């Protein structure tokens, strides 16, 4: 099914021709456009007062990465390397070895945040909720090097943001 | 809101009001409290020069009435 | 003399602002006639403007001329001059002198 | 004829002009060639999906759909009906996102700048729908071979309805600025006429065909989902 | 005393131009459903000051190997002429009471096109020269109608004295007898000042750029004061002159805002299209209305006085 | 005198950060989020950041998108034309370090190989708000400058 | 002294003429003519010809010289040569100043001079009219009479302007 | 209604504690709206809401004037909002941490830090693995 967007014949009676002449000489349709911008002048603007006000986000929001713990404080990550395997950008680098107590844990967990595409595939692939994209999006830096995250930086992000991360997971985990 | 544009318009309006008010008051100050004499044509200039001589102080805006007769 | 003072002040302040604009401190210590490919159409616009401008020069005295007693002659010549401006435009128009294609 | 190398997406145009008239137009592209097609050969099928968000990066989920449909065809599987309805729903939200971008930046380019601002607040509200289903405002990676990644959060359809209820009024305001404006018409009417036969032979598609009277739309003739 | 008077005109002109940059940004903002400057000072009141300081302490680049004599002469002429256009304006009294004031403004503005011509030469770039030559053609073309429209209006006024326009409009604004002329005058001032939808140049740096920008916006305010005087004459009470200044200032502000209102509302003409607007629409009508306004006072017996 | 220099430094710093005119190199998808920062919700112009500026009038360059090898000389030419002081904001993973295309034959692995960078905004793309955070971070960096203080201790 | 304003302007008038008459690059030859035009208007203004003075600004400078510069930027020079670079230009320029300076120096000393012909150096004010008091501008009344007395002048002038349009279009068609 | 509009404008001066308090928020936040105080965090940031504002402007924060020894009277940052309020302020949830507190964990930071880039506290990356190959150390005694 289709419709025509511009298949019409102007009427050629005197009243119609004189209507179009007046539009030509009195600029009536231009004056009409002025009316619409005038109406916007008296509308309340949509601007929010950043940084005192923030744009709304959802619990699914994909922001800065963090490494998480169990309630005991033990690391969740068990160096399975599923995140590294799935990462579309090859932004994750992992090394692991038996910990002094025999635990399977990483000795390296790096995320190049300038390779990362913030796709969230790592947190989908993780079987233990160890790596997540947190809610923080305000972490711009003055140097390139500051965006090469190692395990210490990522654990500190987990400890810094866990209060919010856990609540967001609580809201969305039944959708996963 | 739209009325937050008014402060900028008020500043501009005061800037445009000053030149007109300044010239009007400066003219009164320099012309004995009257309007500046307008002399577009030689007849009006001849009268203004005659005013300067008649004034006795060489100011066309000092005026002499019947007190001088 | 007033007009000279106003003119001298206007262009003197303009000069001062431009030279100051160039000579502010920088805080640095280290080292720092053919035929233009332009259409004939633009030449004809400038020439067309010039000839219409000369016609406007002749029409400028019209407010004073309307005070004449010989109004029949004055009105006839005023309309004669403007009509000839109209004919000039029509000649440019019909000869494609106002086209850009 | 005067020759000009215009331009520094980013476009380089080498144009031969004769006075005011364009004698030749030679677009020089590749300023945004990023070897996507080669990089995809080193990815699994899932890993390649986010590359499709970044092609027509105004129609993200429509690009995902095309790739997913291709993979599902090769897999010989089909997505479940609810995933298909979500994909059509967000495919049409994506069309609004694209068309707002197309019309208003088309208008902004020729000096009609205000409608861009009005309609990009509408775009910002649809970016919220993207973020609420996927956590990203643009590169959702939400439509995948086999369906979608997650179900809609509770309460989203209510907000899409609320957005849609008022949107046709926004279109009307855009039309008040452009549709009958004589300046807009002088800039657009009889510009770039393409015949039906030229359009088909040059490989045009979409509105580039329908603008010339050709009755073709793949959603009608070769429907999907 | 008179030196005080000169400075009491020049300095407010520059401050008014500076704060027009704020008003334009905010008016355009709210028409675009946003706010515009509201952080730098309360309600953006310090934004013009920040912009001006930023521009003057910016590196003042030059084209190099240019007619730098005319790189510096272009903005000096532009700003000097722009400030000169204000000295005969009656508000209600002019700084200089010129018998031929209306013709003095015509003469001075016709020179303003030189700063465009010189700046194109001074760029050393052949494509910048072409753009300058396109702007000159647009400017001189719309000079033609502005002069003929002005002459038509002065046939109801009877003199070239700007303050006589005040006398002519004691009973009624000239916009009523001459709204067709006022429509074309207003559009001509837009195309004359290269304003949208005639801003084809937008289709210098640091302080030199600021001086070109200030000269342009001085002319924009100037042309809108002239429009208010020419067509919306304010009644002048000799014993309360500031009543004139208030009312005439408001009219000038509203007309200047309408320049910003129009910029927010329309697309941009093509070059050939705004040339056809002048040569094939405005000029034919302007010539016909000039004939009509030459005949009209004679056939109604409403010829104005000379003096 | 140190009190006068400190105040003069504060004045010029305030003017330069209160009047940042950006030249946007809208190379790819990150340009769209830059558009949304100019759009009504965030209105960058309300901070004194005009929507669009010509290179010769711009104070900050925003590299918003992938920088390919073909494009790199053009970008460096525009940077060399900017009057000083000039700053560069690198927006998004592509500009920051190559991002998704880091291993491609045709892509510059980070625009900081071509121009000095002042601020790196992470994200693919960064949200409009995240970019605005970066601009406000650039302003604070300018607020820290002590050009006149260092000049008078030379 | 202000009593020699006309003489001072006429000195600048002549210096402007030596400027472009020595013929530097056309761009700077135009500027010298522009400066001469403005000074020439000043000379005319001081003899009571306000309208004639302004016509020089509006038609000569605002009209003809704009087209001269506009055409120069197209069909002639887009880039000037450094002013006074050529010896012929400099030698001609120096000679004109040397001739003018001696005329001024002698005329200002003896209040008279005999460069070919005899001139009085007392000041141009001595010859001015002494008794004026009309309620109008005599110059304006003379120019306005173009429409009352100059019917013939209007016809032949208006016809020449029309032919100018026709002729120039013929010339430039090629 | 213009009198009601002006009365409301006056009520903002009193709603902020007088002229001084009205001017402080005007210059610190470029906003003089009066909302309902939802709560205050341990760093001094104050959180307000007004549900009659349109979505996006219905919640805001007035940042503390000092946080972790940094003067923030004029230098406010979006990263000063601590995680527990971050969720509320960005509308990821409806309930503020005064109503639904976050779960306590021993390892969670007791003190939030804002963006530390550009300062001596900035992160510097480094390899977290130990040396892989051990080189032979020659004997310390002589015997060639
Ligand atoms: C020439 C004289 C022009 C003087 C301009 C006056 C500038 C006033 C000013 O700096 O604004 C206050 C500003 C306001 O501070 P602010 O710019 O940091 O504002 C903070 C509020 N937010 C977060 C919303 C931006 O004060 C300063 O920035 C401190 C420097 C003072 C510079 C003047 C000292 C001399
Ligand atoms: C009793 C006997 C009396 C005798 C006298 C009678 C005379 C009255 C009847 C004649 C009235 C004529 C009105 C004159 C106005 C100019 C008319 C005109 O030229 O408009 C047409 C012009 C071109 O028309 P277009 O559609 O583009 O193409 C037609 C060519 N095929 O299109 C345009 O010019 C449009 C303008 C483009 C710019 C748009 C931006 C301006 C829009 C806002 C305008 C606001 C109004 C101005 C108010 C000014 C106040 C000072
Ligand atoms: C985009 C195009 C938009 C259209 C162009 C812009 C339009 C702006 C028009 C500006 C003029 C509007 C009138 C402004 C009113 C100013 C306040 C005022 O005092 O008005 C007084 C006026 C009558 O007073 P007065 O001017 O003295 O009339 C006597 C005749 N000499 O009372 C009458 O009001
Ligand atoms: C009652 C009185 C009613 C009078 C009705 C007469 C109207 C005649 C209009 C003629 C016409 O139709 O114009 C069409 C034409 C424009 O068509 P275009 O595609 O531009 O090419 C034409 C090339 N000559 O235009 C032309 O052909 C050019 C015509 C000459 C241009 C007209 C200039 C007139 C001078 C203006 C002042 C009028 C006195
Ligand atoms: C670039 C700036 C261009 C300057 C051009 C000056 C043109 C002045 C003409 C303005 C005018 O008409 O009035 C000034 C006056 C003539 O007076 P008038 O107009 O007749 O009215 C009052 C007489 N009672 O005439 C005068 O005041 C005499 C001024 C003579 C000096 C002019 C020097 C011009 C040199 C420019 C180079
Ligand atoms: C071709 C014919 C050209 C000659 C026609 C005009 C003849 C003429 O010049 O008449 C002059 C006449 C004298 O009147 P006036 O100068 O005011 O008083 C004399 C005091 N010395 O002044 C007049 O009253 C006669 C002027 C009549 C004007 C109409 C002339 C015909 C116009 C033809 C235009 C088209 C050709
Ligand atoms: C409106 C008038 C206000 C008057 C205020 C007076 C304040 C005077 C202080 C001026 C401070 C200028 O500060 C200085 O500006 C120049 C450009 O102009 C910059 O640029 C300069 O230095 C850089 C290197 O540092 C050079 O590459 C550059 O070519 C040079 O021009 C400097 O990087 C900046 O340090
Ligand atoms: C009443 C006097 C009227 C005189 C009218 C004369 C008209 C001639 C206009 C000349 C304009 C000035 O000339 C322009 O500016 C100065 C002249 O010093 C030169 O600028 C500079 O040029 C070279 C370097 O390139 C230097 O050696 C010279 O010292 C310096 O002046 C420009 O290269 C020249 O292009
Ligand atoms: N065109 C833009 N970039 N926006 C804009 N309208 N800027 C105007 C900024 C400006 C320019 C010169 C001066 I003097 C002042 Cl006080 C302010
Ligand atoms: S978000 Fe995507 S690109 Fe970034 S680390 Fe996780 S899987 Fe890799
Ligand atoms: S973060 Fe998760 S997916 Fe990655 S290595 Fe650790 S346990 Fe495996
Ligand atoms: S960083 Fe992401 S959003 Fe930005 S240009 Fe690259 S792929 Fe596109």
Automatic annotation (TrEMBL), chain C:
GO terms for cellular component: mitochondrial inner membrane; respiratory chain complex I. The keyword Thylakoid does not apply. It catalyses: a ubiquinone + NADH + 5 H(+)(in) = a ubiquinol + NAD(+) + 4 H(+)(out). Gene3D superfamilies: NADH:ubiquinone/plastoquinone oxidoreductase, chain 3 (1.20.58.1610). Signal peptide: none annotated. Keywords: Electron transport, Membrane, Mitochondrion, Mitochondrion inner membrane, NAD, Oxidoreductase, Respiratory chain, Translocase, Transmembrane, Transmembrane helix, Transport, Ubiquinone. GO terms for molecular function: NADH dehydrogenase (ubiquinone) activity; oxidoreductase activity. It comes from the Eukaryota. Its EC number is 7.1.1.2. GO terms for biological process: mitochondrial electron transport, NADH to ubiquinone. The keyword Transport applies. It is found in: Mitochondrion inner membrane; Mitochondrion membrane. Its main location: mitochondrion. It is an enzyme of class 7 (translocase). It is a multi-pass membrane protein. The chain crosses the membrane at residues 42-62, 74-91. Core subunit of the mitochondrial membrane respiratory chain NADH dehydrogenase (Complex I) which catalyzes electron transfer from NADH through the respiratory chain, using ubiquinone as an electron acceptor. Essential for the catalytic activity of complex I. Core subunit of respiratory chain NADH dehydrogenase (Complex I) which is composed of 45 different subunits. Interacts with TMEM186. Interacts with TMEM242. Belongs to the complex I subunit 3 family. This is NADH-ubiquinone oxidoreductase chain 3.
